[PDB]
C-alpha cells in the first residue's frame, strides 16, 4: 500500500512510520514545509502508525534527538515515538478490510488528516489547535500537549485494567477533536476501508 505523507505545516517535520517492532519503509525522513514523501507499507501490516516529529537534530549517521515523537534517537524509526504524538493508526488486510483512525491517546503534537486516496471510505481528521488550547497541566515543556496517562501514570488514565472511563483530560481532546480517540476505551472512531486501499497523511491540513 502507498501512503503519501505531506507536510503542509509552515515548519519542518520529520515523518516517522513504524509497526512498533520494525520500520515501515525507511521508517523516517525529513519533510520541509510543502514536501511530500511516499512510502510503501506491506499488505497485512497490523498496528502500523505514522506520526510527525518536531525540532529534530540528526548527525550524518542518522542518530540524534527530536522534541516530540523521538524514536530512540533515530532518523529512520524502528520503534514508536515518544509522546506527545498525534497518531495516524492503521491495520491493513485484516480479513479483507483495512482499518484506520487518528488517536490522541499518546497526546498531540501536530494536526493531521488521514484519508484514503482510493474509493470506498472517508478520511479522519484532528486539526484543531490542541497545543494552543492545551490544559496547563498537560502542556509538555518540550513541546506539544501530553495525554494524561503520560503525565500522571494512573490506572484510570492509562486504562491499565481495561476498566477506565472518560476524564476531564480525555474530554478536552475529544471536544477539540471528536473524530480521534481520546482515551483507550473511547467510543471508536475507526473507519473501515476496502482492503488494500492507499492513503495520504497530511500534517497541518488546514
CA–centroid distance for 136 within its chain? 22
- What are the phi and psi torsion angles at 150 (to 5°)? -55, -45
Give Cα separations from 46 to 21, 91, 94, 98 (angstroms): 11, 4, 8, 10
Contact in structure between 39 and 17 (CB atoms under 8 Å): yes
Per-domain boundaries in the chain = 1-206
Q: Using CA of residue 92, residue 127, residue 69, residue 56, what is the dihedral sign? A: positive
The cell for 3 is 501512503
Which class would CATH give 1-206? mainly beta
Question: Is residue 186 a contact partner of residue 177, using CB atoms and an 8 Å limit?
Answer: no
Q: Could you give the C-alpha distances from 165 to 55, 81, 143, in angstroms and in order? A: 34, 25, 27
Q: For the chain, give the longest Cα–Cα distance.
A: 46
CA 164 to chain CA mean position, Å: 22
Query: How many alpha carbons lie under 13 Å from residue 169 in its C-beta half-sphere?
Result: 25
Instruction: Render 145-183 in DSSP notation, one character per residue.
Output: B--HHHHH--HHHHTTTS-----HHHHHHHHH-TTSB-S
Cα–Cα distances in angstroms (integers) from residue 162 to residues 177, 182, 184, in the given order: 23, 15, 8
Amino acid at each position: 500500500a502507498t501512503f503519501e505523507i505531506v507536510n503542509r505545516c509552515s515548519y519542518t517535520v520529520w515523518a516517522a512510520a513504524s509497526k512498533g517492532d520494525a520500520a515501515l519503509d525507511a521508517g523516517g525522513r525529513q519533510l520541509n514545509s510543502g514536501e511530500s514523501w511516499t512510502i510503501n507499507v506491506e499488505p497485512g501490516t497490523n498496528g502500523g502508525k505514522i506520526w510527525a516529529r518536531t525540532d529534530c537534530y540528526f548527525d550524518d549517521s542518522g542518530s540524534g534527538i527530536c522534541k516530540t515523537g523521538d524514536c530512540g534517537g533515530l532518523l529512520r524509526c524502528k520503534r514508536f515515538g515518544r509522546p506527545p504524538t498525534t497518531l495516524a493508526e492503521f491495520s491493513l488486510n485484516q480479513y479483507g478490510k483495512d482499518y484506520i483512525d487518528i488517536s490522541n491517546i499518546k497526546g498531540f503534537n501536530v494536526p493531521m488528516n488521514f484519508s484514503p486516496t482510493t474509493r470506498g471510505c472517508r478520511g479522519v481528521r484532528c486539526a484543531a489547535d490542541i497545543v494552543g488550547q492545551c490544559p496547563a497541566k498537560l502542556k509538555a515543556p518540550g513541546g506539544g500537549c501530553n495525554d494524561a496517562c503520560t503525565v500522571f501514570q494512573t490506572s484510570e488514565y492509562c486504562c491499565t485494567t481495561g476498566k477506565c472511563g472518560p476524564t476531564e483530560y480525555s474530554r478536552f481532546f475529544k471536544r477539540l477533536c471528536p473524530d480521534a480517540f481520546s482515551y483507550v476505551l473511547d467510543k471508536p472512531t475507526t473507519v473501515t476501508c476496502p482492503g488494500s486501499s492507499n492513503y495520504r497523511v497530511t500534517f497541518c491540513p488546514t
